[model samples]
Target: KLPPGWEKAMSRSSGRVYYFNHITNASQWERPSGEPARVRCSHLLVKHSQSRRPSSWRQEKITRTKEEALELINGYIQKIKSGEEDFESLASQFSDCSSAKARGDLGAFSRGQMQKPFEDASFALRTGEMSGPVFTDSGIHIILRTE
Candidate 1:
């Protein structure tokens, strides 16, 4: 029930499932590097934003392969990058996150507030720059860093 080179383990107390790469011996656990960098961003979520409150979130259920999902989101990302679409507009129209109501604004956050991969990717972006595909437990994301 896992990918090649992926090994699954469980937490002792919580019994939560964790996976690690056998080749790299790396797990998707948070390893903070000093203080969390400050970043403000908006995200267009491909799926639900986990347990966050849903705000006028009209859900869309479509069967899509991982490749299809990537292609679909890549097109949207391209539009934002080319100035054909703004993050707020796209987030309102397409994002599955409740923050879509606020134009996808998650306000400002540091590393611990979000998934490590997403936090890292968002912080790496410069102001007014948009990030490529960033994945979380929820789904794929396209982030636009505001500050």
Candidate 2:
């Protein structure tokens, strides 16, 4: 049987059968092959001077060093783990990515859609699970698997 909330629906425009996931609001032409082909995640990014693009909406000129970014990310990890703050709230306040405006919501993405390290970390987590800091071209990040 198909996964819950996933229905085989016909596309009105193309008149082709596609799989739709009501739960995550995602769709694809390919059939499910045991594991999910897509994953949804939210992430908090902390940009450092060494990042490919060292600037962000949070700071026009990101001056923090890599070590500093790591320290900051670790602190956030502690707070989140201790239940002192929620991921969305903290991400909205402190994340350097533009997605922070949406409480770090990155929506749904499939393999190869994101940086390798970031994509791997996100895909590895189960729903409602959080990851430790992951390094990418943009910055260091804490990812939360939402789907």
Candidate 3:
């Protein structure tokens, strides 16, 4: 691989393929020319310069429908309602939020801080109930509420 023709098939960490500079970042992130481009973390100045350990580094990877996420959430919601007290287990398997490490212990938030659909349904559920597979701009979600 040399010059401008170099290409990469998939990320070592994510197994997601970048098509042709389409994964690129930097000032070019907002500029969409409609031409096919696949980019990677190596192409981004910020990620490339200071990133190495896979645990802390972040990058985007696309997936088909939110099936896995919704499944994990629903599965855990089922368990928690059935006497499982492990919200972290549920979050570890489902949450897109990084705090999933702390079991999605997002601390606290207000109505205005959360998106409308999420805030409304999440707030409306009984303390031990969950509701989701709800579509939002980000993706489908299966929310879990706990006491």
TM-score result, candidate 3: 0.45
Compared to the true structure, candidate 1 yields what TM-score? Answer: 0.64
In model 3, residue pairs whose N, Cα or C atoms come closer than 3 Å (at least 3 residues apart or on different chains), thus clashing, are: 20-37, 20-38, 21-37, 21-38, 21-39, 22-37, 22-38, 22-39, 23-39, 133-141
Worst 10 residues of 1 by lDDT: 26-35
lDDT of each: 0.67, 0.85, 0.41
How well is each residue in 1-147 modelled by candidate 3, as lDDT tens digits? Answer: 421222445556766654332111101112223211211100000111112221221335433334554554456556755667565565655455565555555444556655565555455443444453444445444555543
Model 2, residue 86: displacement in angstroms? 0.6
- Ranking the candidates on TM-score from highest down gives 2, 1, 3
The sequence of per-residue lDDT tens digits that candidate 2 reaches over residues 11-122 is 9999999977544334567875445899999999999999999999888999999999999998998899889999999999999999999999999999989998888777
Q: How does candidate 1 score on lDDT?
A: 0.67
TM-score per candidate: 0.64, 0.76, 0.45
Clashes of each: 0, 0, 10
Highest lDDT among the candidates is held by which one? 2
- Sort by lDDT, top down from the best: 2, 1, 3
Candidate number that wins on TM-score, 1 or 3: 1
